[PDB]
Amino acid sequence: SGAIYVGNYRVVNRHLATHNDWANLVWEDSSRDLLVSSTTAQGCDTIARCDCQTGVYYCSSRRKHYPVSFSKPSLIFVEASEYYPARYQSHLMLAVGHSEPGDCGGILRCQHGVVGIVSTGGNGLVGFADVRDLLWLDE
Ligand SMILES: NC(=O)[C@H]1CCCN(C(=O)Nc2cc3c(cc2Cl)OCO3)C1
Numbered sequence: 001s002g003a004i005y006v007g008n009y010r011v012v013n014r015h016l017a018t019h020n021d022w023a024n025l026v027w028e029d030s031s032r033d034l035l036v037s038s039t040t041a042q043g044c045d046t047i048a049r050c051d052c053q054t055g056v057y058y059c060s061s062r063r064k065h066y067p068v069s070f071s072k073p074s075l076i077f078v079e080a081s082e083y084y085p086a087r088y089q090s091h092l093m094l095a096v097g098h099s100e101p102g103d104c105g106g107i108l109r110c111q112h113g114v115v116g117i118v119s120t121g122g123n124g125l126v127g128f129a130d131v132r133d134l135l136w137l138d139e
């Protein structure tokens, strides 16, 4: 689990969104596994606006942060789950690292701010849903 709080928005994995996220829906994209809902309280996370490929992510299955090199946002095949059939997930970035399903929502950050959230795992790889292109998150 985990979310990003920026302004009047909450960003979560679409497969983990609550009834409240759906009742206050702003935008959702199944191909990206992202959902954004509106909040009453003001969020203070800074979203990065960069092309960084190095950062640090939070891994809850290890209670630890790990430094990683990650790929550029791209369309990558993701195996079937209780949430989606087998498909290409867009805007996905991979890194060599530890991830379990419960790790989804852990934030990836660079020196410029929040890059994205854990969205896939397995085989000694971790996938992050990128959020840096969502320029409207700030306005
Ligand atoms: N973005 C998606 O489609 C997600 C939906 C939830 C499930 N997603 C996963 O990748 N699960 C997963 C499977 C694993 C694993 C780690 C993870 Cl995070 O290690 C053993 O098997 C895809």
Ligand SMILES: [Zn+2]
Pocket: 048, 049, 050, 051, 052, 110, 111, 112, 113
């Ligand atoms: Zn950066």
